[PDB]
Design a protein around this ligand. Structure first.
Ligand code: CQK
Ligand code: NI
Ligand code: ZN
Length: 330
């Protein structure tokens, strides 16, 4: 078995290897990459996502979110308080202000220490799930706006016909901006490109051990768990590496820098934080290997996880027994 210890693997495709997205995903899996739940892809040096990021300040963040924590430093939930709209230009200036700027630090280890020590005592702002793309239309390889859709994969594998069209989204982050422990909707893959700015640190649990994380989360957030078995789909819960180690949860960590892709694999739980102002782009995608994860994916039916109407047909086709209950929660 390839990659038995479930280490996060890093790939350096050549230009020729970068010309067929699904073929290269399959190659990474032939090397065991998916056993970690996350992989890093460094594009060939000749490739470029966009020629220049001039005028990115003109993008609108219609509903910036302030991430307010409750709990202890290593075990906390966050809720989002909505803020007034601001442009990326205004957001970047706020990120670099004295209140929000990255602190002096010796190296990544030091910064990660300061994050887990101090995150709960600040409430950073960020811009999430903004439909859009920053790839140049003439970037032809690994352009997240020109991938095959999840609907076309499902139609091809199952011979069904469904509505829906999935598109990429943008994220704007600052120091301490946080993504909570989750897997993707329907346990799909995701791909994330860091366009611009400071790094993003990721934590991941191997798919073969995701239920261990679920059981710990239920123990650590009892009230949250009671309302909904699938409450990690609410994207609210954080658990530090120190607490994971203390409870024997297997995980790994890696830092993504600008110009690098990260892929998450089906049922790979992930979480992380931003080092400073940055801009990323992400989309979900599917392969033939995903179909059996989609059929088994847990669902939130309590109401809290709102998800846009692409997901209806996925529940309807793959999980018809669960559909009426899921639909009631919507
Ligand atoms: O919401 C997510 N996946 O469904 C998600 C969000 C992030 C994130 N990156 N920068 N800010 N947020 C990363 C991984 N996953
Ligand atoms: Ni994610
Ligand atoms: Zn729920």
């Amino acid at each position: 078995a390839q990659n038995p210890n479930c280490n996060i693997m890093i790939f350096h495709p050549t230009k020729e290897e970068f010309n067929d997205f699904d073929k290269y995903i399959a190659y990474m899996e032939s090397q065991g990459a998916h056993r970690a739940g996350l992989a890093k892809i460094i594009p060939p040096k000749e490739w470029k996502a966009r020629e220049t990021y001039d005028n990115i300040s003109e993008i609108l963040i219609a509903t910036p979110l302030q991430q307010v924590a409750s709990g202890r430093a290593g075990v906390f939930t966050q809720y989002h308080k909505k803020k007034k709209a601001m442009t990326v230009g205004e957001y970047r200036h706020l990120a670099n202000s004295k209140k929000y700027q990255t602190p002096p630090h010796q190296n990544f280890e030091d910064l990660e220490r300061k994050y887990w020590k101090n995150r709960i005592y600040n409430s950073p702002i960020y811009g999430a799930d903004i439909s859009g793309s920053l790839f140049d239309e003439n970037t032809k390889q690994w352009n997240l706006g020109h991938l095959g859709t999840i609907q076309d994969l499902l139609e091809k594998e199952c011979g069904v016909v469904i509505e829906g069209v999935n598109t990429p989204y943008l994220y704007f982050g600052m120091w301490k901006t946080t993504f909570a422990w989750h897997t993707e909707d329907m346990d799909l893959y995701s791909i994330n490109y860091l366009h611009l700015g400071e790094p993003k640190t990721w934590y991941v649990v191997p798919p073969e051990h995701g239920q261990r994380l679920e059981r710990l989360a239920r123990e650590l957030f009892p009230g949250s768990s009671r309302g909904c078995g699938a409450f990690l789909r609410h994207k609210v819960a954080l658990i530090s590496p120190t607490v994971l180690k203390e409870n024997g949860i297997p995980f790994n960590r890696i830092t993504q820098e600008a110009g690098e892709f990260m892929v998450t694999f089906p049922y790979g739980y992930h979480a992380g934080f931003n080092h400073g102002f940055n801009c990323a782009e992400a989309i979900n995608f599917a392969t033939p290997r995903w179909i059996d994860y989609g059929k088994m994916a847990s669902q939130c039916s309590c109401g809290e996880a709102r998800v846009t109407f692409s997901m209806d047909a996925f529940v309807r086709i793959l999980q018809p027994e669960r559909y009426d209950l899921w639909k009631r929660g919507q």
